[PDB]
Amino acid sequence: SGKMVKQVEILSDGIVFYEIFRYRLYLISEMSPVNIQGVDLLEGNWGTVGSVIFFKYTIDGKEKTAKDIVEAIDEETKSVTFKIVEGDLMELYKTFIIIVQVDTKGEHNSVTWTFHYEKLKEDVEEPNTLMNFCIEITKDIETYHL
């Protein structure tokens, strides 16, 4: 078991940012094309718990996939929770949960990324590269909107 958390300040509008993750995830492909080539809906509906989304992405030039279930949406805390059920990460991790959270409260304007994960074997790395990648995504989105 394991948990990783990073908070990035964003200079663009947090609400707009949340709404991308919350309602229109398919867009991160246009906004971070270098990182994300595809965001396809396979089951359910965009913006709803239980929907099955498929990601095509590239880390360090290596092409990868993840199939995610949207497991939580929370409009109070401006949070969305994705659980990875298939793909490259599951070669290494039994369980992998990604929560994205946008703080708009006050002059505070930030995106917090949380990984909860269970490794398959003791000597698998902490998912630092993946956290770096989510921060790049955050910054692509920010600059795209700024």
From Swiss-Prot:
Gene3D superfamilies: 3.30.530.20
PTM note: The N-terminus is blocked.
Signal peptide: none
Listed Pfam families: Bet_v_1
Domain of life of the source: Eukaryota
Subunit structure: Monomer.
Protein name: Kirola
Organism: Actinidia deliciosa (Kiwi)
Lineage, opening ranks: Eukaryota, Viridiplantae, Streptophyta, Embryophyta, Tracheophyta
